[PDB]
């Protein structure tokens, strides 16, 4: 689930993912079954967003592939509590019983929590956190746990339910429960948007539980885990260094502090930013990450093992 706040371009990055998603194995991958047959379900969306998604899917040549279930804001509220279920049932039939890889984009799950709140209030039931129904966790589990590969069939279901925090927080019951259930969390931060980077994805709050399974020497460069774990550590420690220098002054910083600050600058500018229509090959991305890492000396690269260092520290 992509965690976002009001105004951030979560819809734009969702469309970019829809246009760019594809297999990676040895860079080899017609593939009609490999075509992701995206099923897009929009709940409580401003008509501009619906028109945007429609036009993007039409322009990308996927109009013969994608499928759209729309529940606009002006449309009746209750249908928002049925639309994602319909979308998931259609995805299940298209994937498990038809052998097509399927991708799902649920939009504005907060607009589904609102429907749950309205229904629960209309029944005079006991409220939960912030007045949300006590069984919101059960409903969110029922709506999320319907994705995953199945042993007996060649299909698959991979969903990316985008979410809008009400006041740009996480303690709110809906994003909290979604984090509890879902196996990941992509964070789009207002700070990055204020600094005008088109993908505002804050890489530090981010998390994927199944990250250790997707990567590997059989499908990725052997250094991928090391590279990621080092960039994360340097970015986090450099952020701490910048926070310290905000009060102790730029003069009080040490050489390692200056290296960390330069790493932060080039990471947030050259690395995170990407074109709104330009992709990056995974190996190209790893090359860029290695260029970012090689700012520091070999001694400071504590997480990266020497075996991967020898094959990559020079290139």
């Amino acid at each position: 689930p992509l965690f976002s706040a009001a105004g951030l371009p979560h819809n734009e990055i969702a469309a970019q993912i829809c246009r760019q998603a594809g297999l990676v194995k040895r860079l080899e991958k017609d593939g009609e079954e490999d075509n992701f047959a995206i099923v897009f379900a929009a709940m409580g969306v401003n008509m501009e967003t619906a028109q945007f998604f429609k036009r993007d899917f039409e322009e990308n040549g996927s109009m013969e592939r994608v499928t759209l279930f729309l529940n606009l804001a002006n449309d009746p509220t209750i249908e928002r509590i049925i639309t994602p279920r319909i979308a998931l049932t259609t995805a299940e039939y298209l994937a498990y019983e038809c052998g097509k890889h399927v991708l799902v984009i649920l939009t504005d799950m907060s607009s589904y929590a609102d429907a749950l709140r309205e229904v629960s209030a209309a029944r005079e039931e006991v409220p939960g956190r912030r007045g949300y129904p006590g069984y919101m966790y059960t409903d969110l589990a029922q709506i999320y746990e319907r994705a995953g590969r199945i042993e007996g069939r060649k299909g698959s279901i991979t969903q990316i339910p985008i979410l809008t925090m009400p006041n740009d927080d996480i303690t709110h019951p809906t994003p909290d429960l979604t984090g509890y259930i879902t196996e990941g969390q992509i964070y789009i931060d207002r700070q990055l948007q204020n600094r005008q980077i088109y993908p505002p994805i804050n890489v530090l709050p981010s998390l994927s539980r199944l990250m250790k399974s997707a990567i590997g020497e059989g499908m990725t460069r052997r250094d991928h885990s090391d590279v990621s774990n080092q960039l994360y550590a340097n970015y986090a420690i450099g952020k701490d260094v910048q926070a310290m220098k905000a009060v102790v002054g730029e003069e009080a910083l040490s050489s390692e502090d200056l290296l960390y600050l330069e790493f932060l600058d080039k990471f947030e500018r050259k690395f995170v930013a990407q074109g709104a229509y330009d992709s990056r090959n995974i190996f190209q991305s790893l090359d860029l990450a290695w260029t970012l890492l090689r700012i520091f000396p070999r001694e400071l690269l504590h997480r990266i093992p020497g075996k991967t260092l020898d094959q990559y520290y020079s290139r």
């Binding site: 006041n167 740009d168 927080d169 996480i170 303690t171």
Partner: protein, 44 residues
């Protein structure tokens, strides 16, 4: 910032730490001022 019990605790801890650091910095500044006064008297 988003209001929460954990956020309230963090803010209280930050305030306490700021007060302690302010006291320590005031002590250091007083010592440095005493040394500066001694140096000025010696120069005079």
């Amino acid at each position: 910032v988003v209001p929460t019990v954990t956020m309230l605790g963090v803010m209280k801890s930050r305030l306490v730490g700021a007060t302690r650091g302010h006291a320590l910095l005031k002590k250091k500044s007083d010592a440095l001022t005493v040394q500066f006064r001694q140096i000025l008297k010696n120069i005079v």
